[PDB]
Scaffold this motif. Structure first.
Motif: not given
Lengths: 156, 123, 447, 26, 171, 162, 181
Positions: A72-84
């Motif tokens: 869960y920690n790794r997904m929060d620091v990469l959420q903007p990359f997936f959307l963009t």
RNA sequence: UUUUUUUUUU
RNA sequence: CGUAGCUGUAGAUGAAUGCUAAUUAUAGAGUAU
RNA sequence: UUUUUUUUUUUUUUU
RNA sequence: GGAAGCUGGAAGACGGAAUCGUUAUUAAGCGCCAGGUAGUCCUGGACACUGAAUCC
């Protein structure tokens, strides 16, 4: 092609020559290099984006999963990359000083989010759905004096 | 894991070094590879049974010109690994949209890629 | 095939070889494009985007030609380079008009570089720029490193074999296909050595020939003043802001990636397979250049001596007819490395020298004139040699440079005696009288 | 250091200084 | 096969692989094969670039014996053990005497016997028998045909120590 | 079986249970145990699988192998048994609570449909109104938010009998 | 040699117990400037040193079971100044001390420098023939930037060494050593 | 929850 | 920094830590079983 | 960074 | 008076009943020291990390 002469002729030299590297109009429209800062709890962050399909290094020449073994920690620091859609295009460099395990993860989300907007003003409206730009300036409340050992822990 | 009375005060707390045994000593000599006129030896270490740390290669028998330092899987090889599992009916559904998204999560490491995709549905 | 329903294991015994035989310039390619114009036109929101731009370039290529620069000086900067690059290679009262056109092309070629570097090229335009320079033999020590990263990141991308061709029509009339996947795999061996033998040094590098030089490591010198000093009561200052501005000192540094070295390692293995194929002597010169690297390959793996030993073994067993013409390039690169199989290799190369000079008339001036020309431009593809002799006015001006570097190459060895004393006197006397008649002027003077 | 919290801290602190103390009970 | 074929998976028969590797799979591959529900599915191994550089060296080494070839072992440091699942089976198919030992520590962290001696080297009678028994499963038909030299008859002690080195303890 | 025990001396995790694409499947991170969720009659029952350590030397598949992959292999084989045999597949006629699904509660100060949910420490409120959409359209939208948001973060919520 | 010395730098520090008192010192120091003989007066740099605080605790009225507490905060203020190339000692030392007002002490730190052998070489260069065979701002320091960088690095080196040595010689019960008796 | 080194092994 | 992740042992029916022939440290003096 | 590393994070500071 | 080695068969798996209250970086856990002018507490003061749920 007269319209481009006024737009392209003003960005060069003059006021701000930094904005000169672009990747076409449609599909990327992202700057070569960008900077961002994020603060969350008793910690700070300084994330910089640079062109390149390399790995992710935080500090002291180490990997990313070492700092955040949890999923869960790794997904929060990469959420903007997936959307963009910048999943494998731009690099990521995270520098933090102090905090805790999950405290530092939140600062990265705010730091990286403020960098994408600078690189592309248009690619900022879609990020409001997940509330990425939102922060939390509030901190822990102080321990009141008296008989309560904790904030509101009563006694017999 | 053995116990004996060969400890040097507090060096082993009364334990037998692994390299002091018969079988482990037979496979713990790289400097003798020159006598092998027929072939040669080879070894590799990748597991996490012990922290490598500095891992001095000069005081062990090998030289700096005979060490093959591999790196993490490239993006090209990463795509093939994911597609291989699909043919085996391992994963349920792996959309192509998140194919590159998972590369940054596990970092492309083989150990972190198989475990992350196994726990979750994958993709 | 095995009875279990699998491939027989005996097939996978040896390793296949590589080709890279053909090599053509950008001159004849354009002629074919202008002929097959009526056949190339036979071939959702994105449907129009991939057609509208795709046909406009075809008609234009044959931005108002090679005129109207400055004002005009995006793919616009990329297509313009093709016209200039192809015009220069055409050469390879009359001296007045020709000079006017030749000078304009050179001046305009350099001007386009300033705008090209200011914008990061895409994967679809990086290879075209690099390929054009190789044909024209116009490299840049500052631009080469920048364009090398793009060719590497995209090569190892997930969408390599599945992705179709680039939309410039340049790839339509090309032997290879499958976009960049197989395009680089069939790259000529002559151009492959460039990636391996790439200079990554900066301008600050002057501690080798120039002299002492202290490099700076603190450009920014932030000093406060009296007009921009923080007030004493800093507690109220934070309350007069919309958001947090001042923060603890946290700055992230830049970490250098492979910088194209990852791709170079893969290319080095290709040259190893092209040794035991009994190929031409000209094609084999590229293998030595890559093996003679000093800043990219390093000594990580124990393959450098093995590849060099195999190359020397095959080179030794060859006829003198095909070895005599190729003597300056092979000796220049082979002398930069030391191996056990050094004395035996050089002994064979020394014998052919005696016959090469005797047959050329060296101790009827046309025999010695034509021989030097072939060794200076025809043989060396793009190499830059001792003193920068790299790929005649009155007498003994160009041939002298070729002979000057040849002697230094044989005396460079560090395995055994360079040569015999008698050979030195004969070689010295060979050029002694030749340099006497070197026009005792102009800028064509031995620096 | 009377309880198991403070008392165990001393043993753990010495473990980080280059010493080995048995841990086990308390 | 070649530089063009990098990062591809090579199919292997389930029955053929067991015979070629009686001891077991190389590395932790046994944890990934059990996840496949199909029992008749083949086993695939990726061909990394690290194997191409190592495989070429072995080819030249064999041809020489029929100082250019390497005469020393290598070391993989840093997926280092993944190549073992493809380099061992291939070599064994080319009539090569390969000594397989993926788990050498099993003879040091299990139930066994130790008897001290003057040489100072502990022996394991229980584990000594398993070393030869497992090696002869696939390497048979070749050791018997191989002759034996006469210059190295019996100059080894009970614990495998040389005569010159063993007698020094009694000095 | 429906008890959510929290050990005293343990690391607190934001998402104890991880939701998977398969309906009858769930991964537990607290005890690194694999479980399957199915409705039986009326209540949720699971089949915990051991993942701790302790044989043939042919291949490391099945039998006594103390590997983390043993639990995964034991779950896939069990899933097909229920579907093929069709023993228990049937819809959850067991209700969650008065306010429809878990986590949704009615407003007391006025007519509203609140749906609270955590996401990376943050939370949302307000949601959609009820007076402007009636007691039918507003109720349908309230449940649709929870199910849609849980598919992205892979968050599993235990259903209580009461 | 004593005559060869020169005041390299003079770090001037202040310690005020009130906000108003510290503000008065800044205004007084500025007024003393812009009055020297040289065209540009000495303009020292600013360097705040945070604001330490202290507040003890006490039980609170007597004969109580510690139900309430009363704290007494005692704030503090600090200020530091830097000097470079202090050619005039009388026009700098006098100005700094004369800018005080109220209970506002000071702590100076002198820094001298001695020159070694004066480099005197490179005479008139040889020559032959072929054989034919300003910009000064208002509120800025007039000293060169290169000199400040050379002196600034020295200060950072001494601070690191002092902290390392001080930590070593810091133990309870001074003069006690293990198994000494 | 614990690593080799100053040389006497075919 | 602690519960880390990871990873060996027994997937404890048997982990409760007080009692004491005996020493470690402060102090001028805390001693006798 | 394909001769680079060989790795968990704190309660004042790069003014 | 504090801590530690060795030794170890001190009294406890009772009760889902009942009394003390929490206005979410609340609650529940875990870790550190500042003063008490030699040592000398499980209380009080004070900081930091993981951090769920309900109809309040």
């Amino acid at each position: 092609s007269s319209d481009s002469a006024l737009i392209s002729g003003a960005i060069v030299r003059a006021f701000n020559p930094e904005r000169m590297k672009v990747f076409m109009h449609n599909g990327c429209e992202w700057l070569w290099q960008a900077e961002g800062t994020g603060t969350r709890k008793r910690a700070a962050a300084h994330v910089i984006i640079r062109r390149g399909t390399g790995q992710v290094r935080v500090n002291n020449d180490e990997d990313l999963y070492v700092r955040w073994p949890f999923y869960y920690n790794r997904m929060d620091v990469l959420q903007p990359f997936f959307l963009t859609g910048t999943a494998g295009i731009y690099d990521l460099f995270i520098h933090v000083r102090g905090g805790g395990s999950s405290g530092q993860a939140g600062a990265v989300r705010l730091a990286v989010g403020r960098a994408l907007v600078s690189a592309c003003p248009a690619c900022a409206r879609l990020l409001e759905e997940d509330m990425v730009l939102y922060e939390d300036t509030r901190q822990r409340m102080p321990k009141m004096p008296g008989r309560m050992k904790a904030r509101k822990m009563r006694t017999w | 894991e053995y116990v004996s009375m060969r400890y040097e005060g507090t060096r082993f707390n009364g334990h037998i070094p692994a390299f002091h045994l018969s079988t482990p000593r037979l496979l713990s000599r790289f400097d003798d590879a020159q006598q092998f006129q027929r072939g040669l030896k080879i070894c590799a270490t990748s597991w996490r049974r012990s922290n490598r740390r500095d891992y001095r290669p000069d005081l062990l028998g090998v030289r700096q010109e005979e060490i093959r330092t591999v790196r993490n899987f490239s993006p090209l090889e990463f795509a093939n690994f994911v597609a291989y599992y699909h043919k085996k009916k391992i994963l349920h559904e792996f959309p192509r949209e998140k194919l590159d998204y998972f590369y940054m999560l596990s970092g492309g490491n083989g150990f972190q890629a198989r475990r992350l995709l196994a726990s979750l549905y994958g993709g | 095939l095995l009875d279990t329903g699998e491939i027989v294991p005996g097939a996978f015994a040896s390793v296949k070889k590589v080709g890279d035989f053909p090599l053509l310039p950008l001159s004849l390619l354009l002629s074919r494009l202008k002929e097959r114009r009526q056949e190339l036109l036979r071939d959702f929101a994105r449907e129009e985007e991939r057609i509208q731009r795709k046909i406009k370039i075809l008609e234009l290529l044959a931005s108002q030609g090679a005129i109207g620069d400055a004002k005009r000086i995006h793919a616009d900067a990329v297509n313009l380079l093709l016209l200039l690059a192809a015009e220069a290679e055409t050469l390879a009262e009359e001296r007045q008009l020709w000079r006017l056109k030749c000078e304009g092309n050179e001046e305009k070629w350099n001007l386009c570089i300033s705008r090209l570097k200011e914008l990061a090229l895409d994967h679809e335009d990086s290879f075209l720029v690099f390929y054009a320079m190789c044909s024209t033999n116009r490299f840049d020590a500052v631009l080469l490193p920048a364009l090398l990263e793009r060719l590497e990141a995209s090569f190892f991308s997930s969408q390599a074999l599945s992705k179709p061709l680039f939309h410039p029509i340049f790839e339509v009339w090309d032997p290879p296909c499958e976009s960049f996947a197989a395009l680089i795999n069939v790259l000529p061996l002559s151009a492959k050595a460039v990636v391996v033998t790439a200079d990554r040094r900066s301008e600050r590098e002057r501690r080798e020939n120039e002299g002492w030089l202290a490099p700076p490591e603190a450009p920014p010198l932030v000093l406060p003043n009296w007009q921009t000093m923080h007030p004493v009561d800093m507690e109220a200052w934070e309350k007069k802001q919309r958001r947090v501005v001042r923060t603890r000192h946290v700055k992230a540094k830049i970490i250098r990636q492979a910088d194209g070295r990852k791709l170079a390692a893969t290319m080095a293995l290709h040259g190893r397979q092209a040794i035991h194929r009994d190929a031409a002597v000209s094609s084999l010169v590229s293998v030595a250049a890559m093996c003679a690297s000093n800043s990219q390959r390093a000594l990580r793996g124990e393959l450098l001596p093995e590849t060099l030993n195999l190359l020397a073994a095959e080179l030794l067993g060859r006829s003198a007819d095909a070895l005599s013409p190729h003597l300056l390039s092979l000796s220049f690169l082979l002398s930069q490395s030391s191996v056990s199989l050094t004395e035996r290799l050089f002994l064979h190369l020394e014998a052919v020298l005696r016959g090469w000079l005797e047959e050329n008339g060296f101790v009827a001036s046309e025999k010695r004139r034509k021989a030097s020309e072939e060794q200076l431009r025809n043989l060396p593809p793009g190499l830059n040699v001792f003193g920068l002799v790299q790929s005649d006015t009155e007498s003994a001006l160009w041939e002298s440079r070729v002979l000057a570097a040849l002697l230094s190459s044989f005396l460079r060895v560090d395995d055994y005696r360079p040569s015999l004393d008698f050979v030195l006197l004969l070689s010295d006397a060979l050029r002694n009288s030749l340099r006497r008649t070197a026009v005792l002027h102009e800028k064509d003077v031995l620096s | 250091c009377m309880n198991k919290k403070n008392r165990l801290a001393l043993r753990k602190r010495r473990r980080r200084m280059g010493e080995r103390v048995s841990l086990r009970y308390r | 096969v070649g530089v063009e074929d990098v990062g591809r998976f090579r199919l292997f028969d389930r029955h053929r692989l067991v015979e070629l590797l009686p001891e077991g799979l190389a590395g932790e591959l046994s944890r990934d094969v059990e996840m496949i529900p199909s029992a008749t599915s083949p086993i695939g191994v990726m061909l990394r670039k690290a194997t191409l550089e190592l495989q070429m060296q072995l080819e030249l080494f064999a041809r020489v014996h029929a100082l250019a070839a390497v005469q020393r072992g290598f070391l993989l440091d840093g997926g280092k053990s993944c190549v073992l699942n493809y380099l061992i089976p291939w070599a064994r198919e080319n009539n090569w005497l390969v000594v397989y030992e993926p788990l050498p520590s099993r003879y040091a962290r299990e139930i066994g016997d130790i008897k001290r001696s003057s040489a100072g080297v502990y022996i394991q009678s229980s584990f000594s028998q398993e070393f030869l028994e497992r090696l002869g499963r696939f390497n048979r038909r070749l050791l018997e045909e191989l002759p034996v030299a006469r210059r190295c008859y019996g100059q080894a002690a009970l614990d495998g120590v040389h005569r010159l080195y063993a007698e020094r303890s009694y000095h | 079986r429906q008890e959510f025990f929290w050990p005293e001396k343990a690391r607190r995790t934001r998402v104890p249970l991880y939701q998977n694409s398969r309906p009858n499947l769930v991964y537990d991170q607290r005890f690194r145990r694999f479980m399957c969720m199915w409705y039986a009659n009326g209540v949720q029952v699971f089949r915990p699988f051991s993942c701790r350590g302790r044989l043939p030397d042919g291949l490391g598949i099945g039998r006594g192998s103390g590997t983390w992959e043993r639990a995964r292999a034991k779950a896939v084989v069990l899933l097909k048994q229920l579907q093929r045999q069709g023993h228990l597949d049937r819809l959850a006629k067991p209700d969650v609570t008065r306010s429809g699904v878990r986590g949704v509660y009615f407003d007391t100060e006025e007519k509203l449909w609140v749906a609270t949910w955590n996401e990376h420490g943050l939370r949302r409120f307000k949601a959609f109104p009820t007076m402007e959409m009636g007691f039918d359209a507003a109720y349908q939208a309230a449940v649709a938010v929870r199910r849609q948001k849980l598919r992205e973060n892979y968050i599993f919520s235990m259903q209580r009998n009461r | 040699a004593l005559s060869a010395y020169s005041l390299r730098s003079l770090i001037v520090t202040y310690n005020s117990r009130n906000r108003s008192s510290m503000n008065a010192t800044i205004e007084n120091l500025k007024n003393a400037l812009r009055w020297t003989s040289p065209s540009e007066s000495s303009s020292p740099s600013s360097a705040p040193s945070s604001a330490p605080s202290s507040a003890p605790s006490s039980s609170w009225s007597p004969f109580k079971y510690k139900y309430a507490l009363r704290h007494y905060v005692f704030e503090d203020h600090r200020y530091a100044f830097a000097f470079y190339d202090v050619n005039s000692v009388q026009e700098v030392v006098s100005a700094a001390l004369g800018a005080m007002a109220g209970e506002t002490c000071c702590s100076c730190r002198f820094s001298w420098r001695f020159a070694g052998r004066p480099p005197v070489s490179l005479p008139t260069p040889p020559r032959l023939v072929p054989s034919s065979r300003a910009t000064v701002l208002r509120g800025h320091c007039p000293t060169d930037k290169e000199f400040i960088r050379r002196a600034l690095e020295e200060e950072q080196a001494v601070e690191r060494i002092r902290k390392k040595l001080d930590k070593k010689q810091l133990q309870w019960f001074p003069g006690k050593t293990p198994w000494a008796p």
